[PDB]
Amino acid sequence: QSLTKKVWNLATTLAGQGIGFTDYITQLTYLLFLKMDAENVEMFGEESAIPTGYQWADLIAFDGLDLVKQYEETLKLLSELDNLIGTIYTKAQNKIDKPVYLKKVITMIDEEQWLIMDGDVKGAIYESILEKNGQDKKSGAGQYFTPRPLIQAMVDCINPQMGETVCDPACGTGGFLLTAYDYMKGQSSKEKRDFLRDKALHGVDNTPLVVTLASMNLYLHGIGTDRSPIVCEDSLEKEPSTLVDVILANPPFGTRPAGSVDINRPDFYVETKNNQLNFLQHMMLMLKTGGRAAVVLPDNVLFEAGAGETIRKRLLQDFNLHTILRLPTGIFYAQGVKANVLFFSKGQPTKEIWFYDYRTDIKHTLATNKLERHHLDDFVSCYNNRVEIYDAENNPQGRWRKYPVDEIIARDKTSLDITWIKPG
Numbered sequence: 242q243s244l245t246k247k248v249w250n251l252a253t254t255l256a257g258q259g260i261g262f263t264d265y266i267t268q269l270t271y272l273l274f275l276k277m278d279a280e281n282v283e284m285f286g287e288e289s290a291i292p293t294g295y296q297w298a299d300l301i302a303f304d305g306l307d308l309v310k311q312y313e314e315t316l317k318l319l320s321e322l323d324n325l326i327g328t329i330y331t332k333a334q335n336k337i338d339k340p341v342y343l344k345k346v347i348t349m350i351d352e353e354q355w356l357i358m359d360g361d362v363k364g365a366i367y368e369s370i371l372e373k374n375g376q377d378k379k380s381g382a383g384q385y386f387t388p389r390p391l392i393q394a395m396v397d398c399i400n401p402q403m404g405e406t407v408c409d410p411a412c413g414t415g416g417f418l419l420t421a422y423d424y425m426k427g428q429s430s431k432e433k434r435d436f437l438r439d440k441a442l443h444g445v446d447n448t449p450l451v452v453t454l455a456s457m458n459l460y461l462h463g464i465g466t467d468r469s470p471i472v473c474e475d476s477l478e479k480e481p482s483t484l485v486d487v488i489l490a491n492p493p494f495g496t497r498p499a500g501s502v503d504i505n506r507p508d509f510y511v512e513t514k515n516n517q518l519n520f521l522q523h524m525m526l527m528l529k530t531g532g533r534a535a536v537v538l539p540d541n542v543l544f545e546a547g548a549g550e551t552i553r554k555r556l557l558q559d560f561n562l563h564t565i566l567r568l569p570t571g572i573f574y575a576q577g578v579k580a581n582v583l584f585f586s587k588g589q590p591t592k593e594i595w596f597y598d599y600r601t602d603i604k605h606t607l608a609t610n611k612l613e614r615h616h617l618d619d620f621v622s623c624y625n626n627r628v629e630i631y632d633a634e635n636n637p638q639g640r641w642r643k644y645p646v647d648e649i650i651a652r653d654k655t656s657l658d659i660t661w662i663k664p665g
């Protein structure tokens with residue numbers, strides 16, 4: 242709030258040098274955590290945990306190639322540490338080679354009092370910064386972000402409860418985990434208030450800086466003290482060591498980058514190069530019996546022949562794919578995206594699949610008619626009240642329709658890419 246504007250103007254200035262928004266924001270985060278540590282030494286007494294010689298006061302004293310060297314040394318030592326600090330500084334790395342322009346970020350962070358602010362305030366500034374980068378049409382940070390309105394509706398439908406484990410195995414900025422924690426925190430303790438605190442959440446992302454942003458975000462909203470729920474791993478690489486109650490995820494829509502290690506997963510139902518089918522497999526394999534998932538996936542997952550069908554067959558047999566939400570265009574960073582939310586539990590077969598079409602004749606964009614949480618109110622009510630809106634003769638254009646599993650098994654390729662609403 243005016244602090245946000247100052248953060249945004251330093252962003253364009255570094256952009257003026259060769260320094261992009263995502264890089265700026267990681268360096269801002271590295272510096273912010275360090276400053277806040279120092280503040281906590283005055284504001285509440287105790288000894289720092291940051292090594293001696295590398296605290297905030299040591300940093301601000303240098304100016305030249307010397308400033309850049311001290312900063313880099315500082316990031317090296319912190320990355321070597323454990324728990325929350327080590328997570329914030331995961332494979333930490335300076336991207337600002339220019340002393341003058343680093344000193345500007347340092348100087349801006351130094352001049353405020355971060356501990357003291359309303360605490361909600363730090364959260365909301367950070368969420369606001371993450372979003373403005375995330376919906377930046379030519380910055381491509383949207384690959385690291387999901388719109389909050391949609392996360393909220395998903396968490397509301399899944400309805401996580403105190404005592405459950407929640408995992409997002411492709412966590413980006415940590416929005417699902419942040420929202421599921423807020424949802425659970427306001428419910429009726431104490432083995433379980435402590436469970437939420439220490440044991441409920443887990444997030445995985447393979448990209449170091451994104452782990453830095455996620456672990457900071459969770460921390461700035463009061464999630465954790467000395468430990469982070471976020472780990473830096475490649476989810477597809479390894480069979481999961483622990484099964485969970487709830488999965489919440491928006492996995493990458495893009496291909497696995499070239500030169501990434503080849504995966505070796507005998508536990509998978511089928512070998513495929515489709516990155517999204519593999520995330521879907523990995524997540525099905527991650528659930529406990531009785532567990533449930535809500536996951537954002539592309540249309541391709543619903544129609545693709547070969548491996549896709551094999552997996553959709555497995556999904557119908559051993560899981561209850563009770564709900565598919567068809568998402569509108571114009572809500573993700575890179576619009577065009579044809580996406581869907583699939584909700585399913587593990588154990589029981591699918592007998593019926595309820596479709597909610599929020600795509601056909603729906604018009605959102607990032608600049609005008611923005612998606613907000615109230616647009617998914619009807620969906621959420623349908624989710625809870627399993628009474629068909631569609632009727633062949635009374636309401637053929639109704640958004641909520643139930644299909645028995647036998648019609649789906651009878652479709653070509655076992656396709657789940659079903660619509661029925663005439664645009665006309």
Ligand SMILES: C[S@@+](CC[C@H](N)C(=O)[O-])C[C@H]1O[C@@H](n2cnc3c(N)ncnc32)[C@H](O)[C@@H]1O
Pocket residue numbers: 383384385386387410411412413414415416417445446447448451474475476477490491492493
């Ligand atoms: C669309 S983002 C998730 C956004 C998140 N829902 C939020 O609140 O910001 C997808 C994430 O998956 C990560 N990712 C890509 N490949 C991965 C992999 N193999 N293992 C774990 N994470 C991966 C990306 O780095 C990216 O942050």
